[PDB]
Every structure is written in C-alpha cells, then in structure tokens.
Design brief:
- By secondary structure, the chain is mainly α.
- The chain has one domain: Single alpha-helices involved in coiled-coils or other helix-helix interfaces.
- Helix content is 65%, strand content 0%.
- The radius of gyration is 20 Å and the shape is elongated.
- It is classed as transferase.
- Keywords: transmembrane, transferase.
- It forms a monomeric assembly.
Amino acid sequence: GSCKIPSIATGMVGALLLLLVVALGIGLFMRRRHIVRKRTLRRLLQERELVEGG
C-alpha cells in the first residue's frame, strides 16, 4: 500500500503558488496608488476610446 504523487499535478502546484505570490505582491503594491478615485482614470480611457470605446 504505497503512495506517490504524479507529475501532471506538480506543474500546476508550482504555478499555483508562483502566480499567487506574483499577483499578490503586485496587487498589494498597486493597491497603494489605486487608493485614488479609480473613476478618474475611467473617465480618461472612455475619452481615449482605445479599449472597447467608440
């Protein structure tokens, strides 16, 4: 009755943690400047009509 972990699940794990930390660090960091009224930027982009606008 021996046990062993596959590899198809390993790759996912490693990436799961990596992405978690990556998005975390960046998220917590960008959460410092994002504190400002996000509506401000929304008004700019809307006028820029570069992404889903026009």
